[PDB]
Scaffold this active site. Structure first.
Site, PDB file in Angstrom:
ATOM      1  N   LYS C 165      51.950 -45.287  -9.351  1.00 30.88           N
ATOM      2  CA  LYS C 165      52.153 -45.349 -10.797  1.00 30.88           C
ATOM      3  C   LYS C 165      51.937 -46.800 -11.214  1.00 30.88           C
ATOM      4  O   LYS C 165      52.113 -47.679 -10.374  1.00 30.88           O
ATOM      5  CB  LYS C 165      53.573 -44.917 -11.163  1.00 30.88           C
ATOM      6  CG  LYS C 165      53.979 -43.527 -10.679  1.00 30.88           C
ATOM      7  CD  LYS C 165      53.194 -42.452 -11.414  1.00 30.88           C
ATOM      8  CE  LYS C 165      53.709 -41.095 -10.989  1.00 30.88           C
ATOM      9  NZ  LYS C 165      52.839 -39.984 -11.419  1.00 30.88           N
ATOM     10  N   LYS C 191      49.609 -41.191  -2.591  1.00 33.13           N
ATOM     11  CA  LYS C 191      48.503 -40.415  -3.187  1.00 33.13           C
ATOM     12  C   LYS C 191      47.978 -40.968  -4.523  1.00 33.13           C
ATOM     13  O   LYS C 191      48.709 -41.613  -5.267  1.00 33.13           O
ATOM     14  CB  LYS C 191      48.887 -38.940  -3.350  1.00 33.13           C
ATOM     15  CG  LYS C 191      49.884 -38.678  -4.477  1.00 33.13           C
ATOM     16  CD  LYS C 191      50.326 -37.214  -4.566  1.00 33.13           C
ATOM     17  CE  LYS C 191      49.293 -36.285  -5.267  1.00 33.13           C
ATOM     18  NZ  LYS C 191      49.078 -36.762  -6.627  1.00 33.13           N
ATOM     19  N   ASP C 193      47.020 -40.334  -8.254  1.00 32.85           N
ATOM     20  CA  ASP C 193      47.488 -39.411  -9.270  1.00 32.85           C
ATOM     21  C   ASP C 193      46.379 -38.394  -9.562  1.00 32.85           C
ATOM     22  O   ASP C 193      45.195 -38.678  -9.336  1.00 32.85           O
ATOM     23  CB  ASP C 193      47.899 -40.145 -10.540  1.00 32.85           C
ATOM     24  CG  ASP C 193      49.232 -39.631 -11.106  1.00 32.85           C
ATOM     25  OD1 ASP C 193      49.531 -38.421 -11.041  1.00 32.85           O
ATOM     26  OD2 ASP C 193      50.071 -40.386 -11.611  1.00 32.85           O
ATOM     27  N   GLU C 194      46.749 -37.206 -10.045  1.00 29.82           N
ATOM     28  CA  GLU C 194      45.765 -36.141 -10.162  1.00 29.82           C
ATOM     29  C   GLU C 194      44.598 -36.561 -11.048  1.00 29.82           C
ATOM     30  O   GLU C 194      43.480 -36.095 -10.857  1.00 29.82           O
ATOM     31  CB  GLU C 194      46.371 -34.839 -10.651  1.00 29.82           C
ATOM     32  CG  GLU C 194      46.929 -34.852 -12.076  1.00 29.82           C
ATOM     33  CD  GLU C 194      48.194 -35.690 -12.231  1.00 29.82           C
ATOM     34  OE1 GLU C 194      49.164 -35.559 -11.452  1.00 29.82           O
ATOM     35  OE2 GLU C 194      48.229 -36.502 -13.150  1.00 29.82           O
ATOM     36  N   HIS C 284      46.318 -30.401  -5.475  1.00 29.81           N
ATOM     37  CA  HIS C 284      47.101 -30.571  -6.688  1.00 29.81           C
ATOM     38  C   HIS C 284      46.825 -29.420  -7.660  1.00 29.81           C
ATOM     39  O   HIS C 284      45.668 -28.990  -7.815  1.00 29.81           O
ATOM     40  CB  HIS C 284      46.756 -31.912  -7.331  1.00 29.81           C
ATOM     41  CG  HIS C 284      47.709 -32.301  -8.405  1.00 29.81           C
ATOM     42  ND1 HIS C 284      47.680 -31.737  -9.656  1.00 29.81           N
ATOM     43  CD2 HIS C 284      48.764 -33.157  -8.394  1.00 29.81           C
ATOM     44  CE1 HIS C 284      48.660 -32.249 -10.384  1.00 29.81           C
ATOM     45  NE2 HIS C 284      49.341 -33.103  -9.639  1.00 29.81           N
ATOM     46  N   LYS C 324      61.654 -32.662 -12.987  1.00 32.08           N
ATOM     47  CA  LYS C 324      61.286 -32.694 -14.406  1.00 32.08           C
ATOM     48  C   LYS C 324      60.406 -31.509 -14.849  1.00 32.08           C
ATOM     49  O   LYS C 324      60.252 -31.258 -16.056  1.00 32.08           O
ATOM     50  CB  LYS C 324      60.615 -34.044 -14.746  1.00 32.08           C
ATOM     51  CG  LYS C 324      59.206 -34.179 -14.178  1.00 32.08           C
ATOM     52  CD  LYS C 324      58.731 -35.640 -14.157  1.00 32.08           C
ATOM     53  CE  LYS C 324      57.210 -35.705 -14.029  1.00 32.08           C
ATOM     54  NZ  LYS C 324      56.721 -36.937 -13.356  1.00 32.08           N
TER      55      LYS C 324
HETATM   56  O1  LIG Z   1      51.885 -36.771 -12.316  1.00 32.97           O
HETATM   57  C1  LIG Z   1      53.195 -36.669 -11.823  1.00 32.97           C
HETATM   58  O2  LIG Z   1      54.194 -36.684 -12.674  1.00 32.97           O
HETATM   59  C2  LIG Z   1      53.407 -36.550 -10.303  1.00 32.97           C
HETATM   60  O3  LIG Z   1      52.543 -37.524  -9.638  1.00 32.97           O
HETATM   61  C3  LIG Z   1      54.857 -36.838  -9.895  1.00 32.97           C
HETATM   62  O4  LIG Z   1      55.232 -38.126 -10.332  1.00 32.97           O
HETATM   63  P1  LIG Z   1      56.759 -38.616 -10.227  1.00 32.97           P
HETATM   64  O5  LIG Z   1      57.230 -38.444  -8.800  1.00 32.97           O
HETATM   65  O6  LIG Z   1      56.918 -40.057 -10.600  1.00 32.97           O
HETATM   66  O7  LIG Z   1      57.556 -37.704 -11.160  1.00 32.97           O
HETATM   67  C4  LIG Z   1      52.909 -35.184  -9.828  1.00 32.97           C
HETATM   68  O8  LIG Z   1      51.484 -35.232  -9.886  1.00 32.97           O
HETATM   69  C5  LIG Z   1      53.454 -34.017 -10.651  1.00 32.97           C
HETATM   70  O9  LIG Z   1      54.781 -33.760 -10.254  1.00 32.97           O
HETATM   71  C6  LIG Z   1      52.646 -32.753 -10.419  1.00 32.97           C
HETATM   72  O10 LIG Z   1      53.403 -31.684 -10.902  1.00 32.97           O
HETATM   73  P2  LIG Z   1      53.690 -30.350 -10.040  1.00 32.97           P
HETATM   74  O11 LIG Z   1      54.234 -30.788  -8.660  1.00 32.97           O
HETATM   75  O12 LIG Z   1      54.636 -29.587 -10.859  1.00 32.97           O
HETATM   76  O13 LIG Z   1      52.421 -29.523  -9.941  1.00 32.97           O
HETATM   77 MG   LIG Z   2      50.538 -37.030 -10.612  1.00 30.99          MG
END
Ligand SMILES: O=C(O)[C@@](O)(COP(=O)(O)O)[C@H](O)[C@H](O)COP(=O)(O)O
Ligand SMILES: [Mg+2]
Ligand SMILES: O=C(O)[C@@](O)(COP(=O)(O)O)[C@H](O)[C@H](O)COP(=O)(O)O
Ligand SMILES: O=C(O)[C@@](O)(COP(=O)(O)O)[C@H](O)[C@H](O)COP(=O)(O)O
Ligand SMILES: [Mg+2]
Ligand SMILES: [Mg+2]
Ligand SMILES: [Mg+2]
Lengths: 467, 129, 465, 228, 119, 118, 129
Positions: C165, C191, C193-194, C284, C324
């Site tokens: 992040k 990782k 981020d998506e 993802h 969340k």
């Molecule tokens: O983009 C985000 O918020 C995360 O990197 C988590 O960040 P944090 O750990 O800082 O919250 C994940 O990609 C999401 O949780 C994906 O959602 P899911 O697992 O529901 O598909």
């Molecule tokens: Mg993410």
């Protein structure tokens, strides 16, 4: 005592709600229809959507200070309440152009619709519109040909194009498929097509179908003197298989192939559109699965956004709904996204669901395809709605004619040509449409036969996807 | 703010971020193996105790994953005392080796637990400065 | 029986309530909401017809083939308890209808057009029974849980990850810097981020090289295998493959892909590439909640999870339950079994409408990620057990002392919980005590515990059973 | 049950007459002729063992996996009517044992070693049950009957062919000459003899070119699709 | 030579016992990739028979267990281990996973013993 | 003809193939194998290694000791056809790994009527 | 159950799993060479006595297979005493080298036997624990 790193959770609205922000001509803008959980302020909700689709997570991170959040953050810059709803808001989010990978619809969706729809703090979310700025539009190859070039390649002008899906959907052999295609095309249709789910199956392998359909296309073309085609389906399990199919279509010299862009996916689709541009193939796009995403008013993504995305990713044709047929599509909504599909410049117009002025900066228009439970009596309404730059498809409407495909095709072609002539002569199709068809029935025995069979048949139901 | 030291702070997978295991804690892990019907086994290393790459470089290839097996996995063994006695026998024969206790599940066919029981001769609190 | 032109009810052909389903049939359970005045039987028949062989009017070509052999069949309709206008319609599809090894083809048929029918107001695909004879036609996951643990040499606990992040905006060099600090403190994986793909602020190839340097430095410092899920998601298949090939050239263990925004055709291609080149594939599920959040309309995640298992992936995000993003406990436990196990029995209290036999197809590792921190650790270990990856983005990069202490806090927490479980402590009851003890002992963990002590995510669930 | 080194009978693990076969199992029917003093049950178990998971002595590695899941099972033994020393042994093999799409792998397991066992005097594989779940892993025939008739446009009778003779010894030009004469008189196909590949008297590419000239000439003369 | 004749109605049984391959035909074949002498020279192994061993059970072991077994065999004194003839690529063990783990095993046993190893 | 060779065969310098003796053999067979094949052969012990009571490494050592003992004996002029039993027995007395293998398989023979007779 | 030790248990091909060869046993091997008409030769190594891979990695490539030849292969030699004397001369000139006696067959053109006669300064029974 400058702003340091302070660990811990704070409200998203402190960073991501900016109601005084002046949007930039290069920003991607999103309009979200948002339903907060009880006790979550709309501003905090909008800021959450903006944060978690751009740069922010649930707690403060120290790495922010190594970069410029101001430059990169998504910004919720406006929140309107929705008329006659106690808990619905339109939140407007602005995204810097720096956030997006050039020429990738996949990347755009991943950011804007990636995680936010699953947040606990909201009960429902719907992406209603996107403003794609010209500076992002120019990074896409876009449609392989587009409406004008397509008419120029087929040598077809001054009326809608006529198509037809082969039926039954599944279960016909390669040879029978070709047999049916020849009979349809020789009767007056410009195109036939594989059903969206006809790919390669035990009852009919793809390559056998392609060869028999090629024989049928050329035979019908020599018989009628008009250019003919059939949308051979390239949809496949792997990119490599998809490309094999496209390549065989090219080797056969056929004018057009098809792809299910949502069940195949954007990455595959964009690859195929690039191939089609490089090899002169037209690309018909089927929108299978769209209604899983876009039917409900409170949650999902409106089809107008999926249409914008397809235009960027690449397609010469795209199914648009029929308004009057067996599948849902309200008139004003459809007229709005048909403009977004075809036109170069479309002004903001909330009465047609257009939340943003959209400038396509000369990207080619996509031909809307009206298909699904239509028959000869619908012709005047279809010509009225879409005008000439559209393709009208009659599956059941052709293969269900009491005399077979060639008469079926002729009935449809006579009907369309009658309606077109009437419109050109100044007749009002909205008022006089029934009369135009009735006159043509009196004159053409094939048309009459079709008119009798389907006289009673209408699809009138309460609309779910209301404005 | 404390700084996590990069100096000699090598780890050994499961449980190495906890205080070193007491005899009572090791016995409790052994009971867990037995209660679950898993196959206990001992492995030891007299050379490099870490993963490295000498002979090849492609994804998913590493040297130093395999250690030397002590005798054979204790098939059918349901006796925690027997396991504890083999730990003593193995560490007695190889007093300078890395030694680890592992357990296998034959249904999933995978190692289902493992932790170091001896290293050759950072303390849990000298890891930050 | 001849050709008779004209419209007739779908139910005359496509409603067959006496049909005995075959062991090779694909079965669908649709939650269906008819328009007023449309009989449920006619609705189910319509769904069955228009997702298989039928259209709106009779076509003469039917008689050239055998409709009995090829038609989809609505074979059962149950009303839904406590709903006046909702039904579960069960539809059986012959295995002949489907292209071997194509998740794309399966979706196209079963969810292609029917959701847009005027005659229904809402439709939701709740479950699919994929028969073994269809399952066997898929390459499936490149590795699966067991082979993954064997490649990384990691056993006896959950895997620990973390997303870098801010999501977007960091440079390539800063990305690697962050990654090294995370990995060296005790995480197994970091990782992309998506939505981190290749962008003006950071181009993909620059990122891959800096991340590789960071992986190998953290690995040499700790002595444990490390990885970082480099994002192969791209605009074209060619670009996707370029990124996978560069990961392979760098020797890194694992890449990632956003299967729904990239698409099933690209995903299956990538899974096959990964199998052929020994790369692990992290999946993802970006965009899933567009499709799966609402109870009345869409496709339930468990179907999207089954489809991913067939298309191929080694990891797949599964939700956290406590974080969340939404995910109810019983629903989640249900599809986690669908992802990991070889044989799962019908169990409506966990959302499983069909007995599912995976016929030795490798299991997918669930990934719990999204707004979780050290206090959630006992609940996570309790829900998922060892065969899961737990990811802490903000929960690592938001630690007051930086990434390495942040990572160490999460690793201590997970190891403490695992030890307690193995000693026979009940994490559901004693979890808070396990964490509190570990706080007293570890200063890094104590600092994380203080920062996030208050933080909970408790809201009314939308996707209820 | 631990590891106990040494030889024991195959029938203790591999003869399971109460086994209910699964719809995914590959099933084999072996006509079996034991050596004198070898019980048919031990023979059937040996066949099942050595074509699946087992060898001649107990190995410790069995315990790392689940033998129950993977073992071939002799599940039935019928005597053959009017034979004193012949039996049909039925063996079931779990689908996990086989490589998808590979006939090579199936043969290698089922008929790989067992035919050479000292303990039997003769063995014949009579039939296999290939379950649909395995069948679906194969590409199978490129076209099949129906598609073939459709491509050739030939319906409502048997197809007619003919092998060129002599088997070996004709030149490429004479091969084509012979082929044209055959096809033009009413045959649908001619064919290379099985052993006609590429040889000193006639190289393959020369033959392909002259045969192509022949096929097209006969096809234009008759109006019917021709092949070789 | 063995194409059709074994199925002739006119005979009850036929067995091909031997073939004389003349040198002029033999020379048209690439033949063995190395042969005995070159093999000994590549492995640096002389003066005794080579020792091998098939991993068992024939089918059913995972890739990681296969390499585990191979390392223990090779480190004790065998020159070679081997896949069983029917071990190709199967649900319980995919080929490329096996190849990688066996490679790790070969090299570890080689470094431990000082003798060339293979599988 | 007494060895089944119907024709004189001239390989004209084509490399030779190494014979591999494999299938149900153990340490007690070693002298017979070395006598039949000589040095230019590979001998394979599946069950004969993985079925050793102490595991693979000891099993392999037992086979390697046995083969080396037999090779030494042959080179010293001992007749393996006659003295083979004694060579193994001596090696057992000396190597605990071998002794353990010798005990497990002492009884085991494969003697049946030959089908493929000359 | 005894465990075959991985420490430091390096082997040297033929005969290294037997007790070290006595002078009488070496002489018996030499008689075997002479009785068969093979060509005796001595080779020695003053560096790495083992196979390794430094310069290349492809199948069937290894460094360390070649040692240094002592003088020349003793063509035409049918005298066991002469061979025995060269072993002494070689070990005398290189008392710290690995030294091996090999023999060649010139019909098959291959080394037909070989064993170590000296190593630089595990015992046959300390190989298991
Ligand atoms: O983009 C985000 O918020 C995360 O990197 C988590 O960040 P944090 O750990 O800082 O919250 C994940 O990609 C999401 O949780 C994906 O959602 P899911 O697992 O529901 O598909
Ligand atoms: Mg993410
Ligand atoms: O498969 C079908 O149902 C069709 O061939 C129509 O058949 P008929 O002509 O027989 O009605 C079209 O693919 C659907 O119209 C797609 O829907 P849309 O255009 O809304 O995306
Ligand atoms: O699969 C087996 O049975 C073996 O691996 C031997 O195993 P064991 O060493 O454990 O008996 C060999 O493949 C057979 O020798 C083949 O027979 P042949 O060489 O006669 O063709
Ligand atoms: Mg269709
Ligand atoms: Mg013939
Ligand atoms: Mg074998």
């Amino acid at each position: 005592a400058g702003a340091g790193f302070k660990a811990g959770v704070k409200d998203y609205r402190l960073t991501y709600y900016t109601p005084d922000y002046v949007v930039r001509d290069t920003d991607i803008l999103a309009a979200f229809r948002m339903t907060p959980q009880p006790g979550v302020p709309p501003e905090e909700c909008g800021a959450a959507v903006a944060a978690e689709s751009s740069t922010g997570t649930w707690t403060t991170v120290w790495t922010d200070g190594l970069t410029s959040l101001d430059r990169y953050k998504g910004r919720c810059y406006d929140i309107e309440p929705v008329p006659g709803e106690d808990n619905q808001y339109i939140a407007y989010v602005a995204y810097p152009i720096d956030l997006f990978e050039e020429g990738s619809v996949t990347n755009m969706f991943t950011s804007i619709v990636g995680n936010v729809f699953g947040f606990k703090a909201l009960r429902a979310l719907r992406l209603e519109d996107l403003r794609i700025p010209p500076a992002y539009v120019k990074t896409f190859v876009g449609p392989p040909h587009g409406i004008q070039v397509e008419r120029d390649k087929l040598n077809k002008y001054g009326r809608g194009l006529l198509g037809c899906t082969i039926k039954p959907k599944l279960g016909l052999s390669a040879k029978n498929y070709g047999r049916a295609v020849y009979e349809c095309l020789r009767g007056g249709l410009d195109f036939t097509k594989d059903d969206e789910n006809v790919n390669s199956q035990p009852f009919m392998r793809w390559r056998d179908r392609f060869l028999f359909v090629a024989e049928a296309i050329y035979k019908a073309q020599a018989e009628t003197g008009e250019v003919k085609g059939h949308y051979l389906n390239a949809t496949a399990g792997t990119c490599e298989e998809m490309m094999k199919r496209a390549v065989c279509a090219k080797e056969l010299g056929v004018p057009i192939i098809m792809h299910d862009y949502l069940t195949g996916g954007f990455t595959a689709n964009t690859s195929l559109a690039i191939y089609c541009r490089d090899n002169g193939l037209l690309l018909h796009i089927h929108r299978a699965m769209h209604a899983v995403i876009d039917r409900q008013r409170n949650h999902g993504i409106h089809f107008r956004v999926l249409a914008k995305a397809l235009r960027m990713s690449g397609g010469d044709h795209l199914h648009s709904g029929t308004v009057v047929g067996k599948l849902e599509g309200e008139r004003e909504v459809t007229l709005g996204f048909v403009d977004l599909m075809r036109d170069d410049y479309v002004e903001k117009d909330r009465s047609r669901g257009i939340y943003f002025t959209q400038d396509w900066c000369s990207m080619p228009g996509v031909m809307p395809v009206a298909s699904g439970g239509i028959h000869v009596w619908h012709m005047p309404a279809l010509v009225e709605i879409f005008g000439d730059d559209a393709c009208l498809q009659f599956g059941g409407g052709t293969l269900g004619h009491p005399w077979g495909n060639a008469p079926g095709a002729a009935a449809n072609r006579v009907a369309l040509e009658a309606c077109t002539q009437a419109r050109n002569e100044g007749r009002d199709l909205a008022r006089e449409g029934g009369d135009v068809i009735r006159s043509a029935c009196k004159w053409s025995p094939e048309l009459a036969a079709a008119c009798e069979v389907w006289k009673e048949i209408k699809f009138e139901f309460d609309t779910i996807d209301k404005l | 703010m404390m700084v996590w030291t990069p100096v000699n702070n090598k780890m050994f997978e499961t449980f190495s971020y906890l205080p070193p295991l007491t005899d009572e804690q090791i016995a409790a892990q052994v009971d867990y193996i037995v209660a679950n019907g898993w196959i206990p086994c001992l492995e030891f290393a007299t050379d490099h105790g870490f993963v490295y790459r000498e002979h090849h470089n492609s994804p998913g290839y590493y040297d130093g994953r395999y250690w030397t097996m002590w005798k054979l996995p204790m098939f059918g063994c349901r006796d925690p005392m027997q396991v504890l006695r083999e730990i003593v026998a193995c560490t007695k024969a190889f007093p300078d080796a890395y030694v680890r206790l592992v357990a296998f599940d034959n249904q999933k066919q995978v190692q289902i637990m493992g932790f170091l029981v001896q290293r050759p001769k950072q303390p849990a609190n000298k890891r930050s400065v």
